Amino acid sequence: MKELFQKIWQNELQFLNFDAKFQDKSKLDTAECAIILSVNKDNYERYFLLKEFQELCKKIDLRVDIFSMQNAQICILNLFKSGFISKQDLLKALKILEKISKNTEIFDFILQEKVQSIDQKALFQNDFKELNTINLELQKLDENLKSRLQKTLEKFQNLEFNIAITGVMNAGKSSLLNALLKEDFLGVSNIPETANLTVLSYGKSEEAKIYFWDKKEWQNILESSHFNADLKEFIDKLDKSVNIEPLIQNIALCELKNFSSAKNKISALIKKIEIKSHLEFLKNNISIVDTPGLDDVVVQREIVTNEYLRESDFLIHLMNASQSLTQKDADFLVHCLLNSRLSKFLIVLTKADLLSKKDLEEVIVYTKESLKSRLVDLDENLVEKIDFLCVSAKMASDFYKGLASKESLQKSGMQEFENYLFNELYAGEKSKIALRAYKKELHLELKNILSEYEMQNRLIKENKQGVSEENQKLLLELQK
């Protein structure tokens, strides 16, 4: 890549050693790396005179000299190769920055370069069991501290990754969930009426705990029926079958075996179904939240946004390959983009069949342009917050037991989607944040143990000093 550096630093290029001199490997995030890469020899004086760039370089521990800039670029590129910190998201960030710096050469080099082995989850398990071993050693050497360490280990062992998944109804989410789990579960048949939330968790018991509306939630639904005029019709159809005789305080049914009588218009009285199933996917301590799209507006949408705004550590949104942006879907995606808490949610174009490949990419481009048009400022770059996958659940479900026993598992996308979801358990920000919290806890318990054990030595030294003083007093008494 000496040719690349000659290209971008034509005459001000200096004598430099092409390896990553990096000292921390987390010294700067990927957007800051992209900024550093865009200090091409034509913008370099302006960048160096810019106060915000100087603040950035003081944050990173860089100078504004040319040599150190080029050295940092080298190290960034070597980490991009070896430690493989940057995705195509680095390329995204450089495209974003091209507002200022038209840095084509570095962009192309990052594009066309053999990347490396990735190896994420193995590294995650190695680091986590390192930390477990450190916790064990701390437990060895106080009772309160050992109990604290044990509680911390219990907290960080087998902990709660929640995936919310959403989309409009005809687009189809239950079928995609079936294909991900590689067997059937609630619902594969499209029906215009609907709704209740479904929480797929993991446990030894195979419950199907059910929750109905409260008296007040039902009163709110009947209130809104006056305004909706389709909900009013449905409520009129429902109240003929008076299952009200679904009441004041607590409705907790504990078990069922796939009874389809609820499809006969009673699910409208259910709000929340809490499943504890046995599937290895969930055996990895995952929990999925399936969500309605449009029905029973009044409080089923409120409980949907409760479940999503709650723990949910990730968001997947589904759209069928041939939907014309589904105005409600577009409004939801806009709300997602403006929410600064969301931090790079995911999109799946479901039913990847029924549509020619390389036409699916045009559909994605259309989607992104629409989302940009709803956000007219540098706000547009927020659409680069979204990742896009193209999976078809029918082919994957067919390969397991159905018609297409000839290999449709690949050429569908389910395998890649599964890889993505598993990668979000080290690469996802949540896993790294949990590791950082565990490290801080270990440091603080270590500090407590230091405070405990140095005081014993101090007391022993004080006792020795007192013994010496007593000996001196005895000598003085003998002299007297």
Partner: protein, 43 residues
């Protein structure tokens, strides 16, 4: 001299306790470097 000898007898067990504490401190020192390395690996 007798008091000094008694203090030496007690300062055998006291010396052993101090040496154990020193080894604990050295182990904790090792731990902190290890923790810093683990942090460094993260990104």
């Amino acid at each position: 001299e007798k008091v000094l000898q008694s203090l030496k007898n007690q300062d055998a067990n006291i010396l052993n306790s101090f040496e154990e504490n020193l080894e604990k401190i050295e182990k904790l020192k090792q731990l902190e470097m290890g923790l810093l390395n683990a942090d460094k690996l993260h990104h």
